[PDB]
Amino acid sequence: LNIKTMIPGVPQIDAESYILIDYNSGKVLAEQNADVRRDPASLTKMMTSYVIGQAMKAGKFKETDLVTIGNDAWATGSSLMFLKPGMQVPVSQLIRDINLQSGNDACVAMADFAAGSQDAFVGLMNSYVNALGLKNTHFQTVHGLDADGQYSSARDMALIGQALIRDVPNEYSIYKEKEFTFNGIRQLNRNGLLWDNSLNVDGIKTGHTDKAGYNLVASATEGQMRLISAVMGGRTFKGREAESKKLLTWGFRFFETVNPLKVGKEFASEPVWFGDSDRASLGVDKDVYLTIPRGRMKDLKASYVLNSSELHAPLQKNQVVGTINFQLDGKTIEQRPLVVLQEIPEG
């Protein structure tokens, strides 16, 4: 009864804003000031990474291509960390700047390489902001250092994490590298959560400045279930990783993600009048992912209604002809369009 239908309390999170989303269903499991505009600082590089990964998916350059270091990179002499102007560095090394505390010269050199100049790269960053439908994000630079006019939000930063994993998987995989070469030198990933053994963390990006505080976007899996958290304006060194750990742990403990219906699988079959065949094959045109309270998988009910009382030919492929209802304790928790899976022409 009441233990079945219980709504879990949200833990105390010591940050200005946060969000926890399931990667597959898009469901928000917890949120606080998730839309408030804040300085993302070096989390900016998440969008930069997105654009770079789009470039590499489109075949514009490769891991093995050589980049010339411009005076651009230098303008933002005894440290081995900095790129020397006029030197040649493979793309494979520069694009790892995402895992570093700084690496902003690499960042700028890659922007020029991919887009011709910094301003045009920022142009691409901000176009992708619109293409993803983000309402509270805007960028000024590729690295996020020099421009606390730039802003984002927990929700938007989580949605950028999502797009990274979905759209550019090959670029996303750079983020879990624990150790890697940068400028001929062995370097360590800044995301400490990569070394946590209680969770399978494989992303995404950590950052800190005094104005912005501690910020982290993390992603973890348990089974076929993936969560993303964004925690922004975290208040103490102590909590920089612990706070997000608390969020992710909570989501796995109280929620699960189920996949009741896959695209192209016959959910139901219905009589067709005046057709080639007498049978309509019905399902969905998009995979169904639902996030529900953990342990409630077997009380989940699916049923459907048709838009009309009979199906007359002709019927097109992916033609919407009804609704699939998903239910938990006779409450509708999700609806999807019910489509025809196979062309049925007239008799």
Show which residues are catalytic: 42, 45, 102
Nearer to Hg ion, 13 or 107 (CB): 107
Q: Is 229 buried (19+), middle (13-18) or exposed (0-12) by CB count in 10 A?
A: buried
Q: How far is the CB of 166 from Hg ion (least distance, A)?
A: 20
* Contact positions with Hg ion (CB under 5 A) in 121-180: none
Strands, E assignment, the chain: 15-22, 28-32, 66-68, 88-90, 179-182, 185-188, 200-209, 213-222, 225-234, 255-261, 268-273, 279-283, 288-293, 300-306, 311-312, 320-328, 331-340
> Binding residue per annotation — 205?
yes
User: In the chain, after which residues does the backbone break, taking C–N over 2.5 angstroms as a break?
Assistant: 76
User: What does the alpha-carbon distance between residue 131 and residue 245 come to, in Å, rounded to a whole number?
Assistant: 31
The answer to the question of residue 107 lying near Hg ion (CB under 5 A) is: yes
Q: How far is the CB of 143 from Hg ion (least distance, A)?
A: 6
Count interface residues toward Hg ion (CB under 5 A): 4
Cβ atoms of 35 and 136 within 8 Å: the answer is yes
Sorted by sequence, the CB contacts under 8 Å of residue 210 that are 6+ apart come out as none
Nearer to Hg ion, 46 or 154 (CB): 46
Q: How far is the CB of 338 from Hg ion (least distance, A)?
A: 44
Nearer to Hg ion, 125 or 282 (CB): 125
Q: How far is the CB of 48 from Hg ion (least distance, A)?
A: 4
* Contact positions with Hg ion (CB under 5 A) in 71-100: 97
* Window of 28-36, 101-109, 148-156, 297-305 that interacts with Hg ion by CB under 5 A: 101-109
Nearer to Hg ion, 99 or 257 (CB): 99
The answer to the question of residue 45 lying near Hg ion (CB under 5 A) is: yes
User: What does the alpha-carbon distance between residue 191 and residue 200 come to, in Å, rounded to a whole number?
Assistant: 13
Residue choice 48, 118, 229, 281 for contact with Hg ion (CB under 5 A): 48
CA dihedral in degrees (88, 92, 94, 97; nearest 10)? -160
The answer to the question of residue 105 lying near Hg ion (CB under 5 A) is: no
Per the annotation, binding residues are 205
Residues that bind Hg ion (CB under 5 A): 45, 48, 97, 107
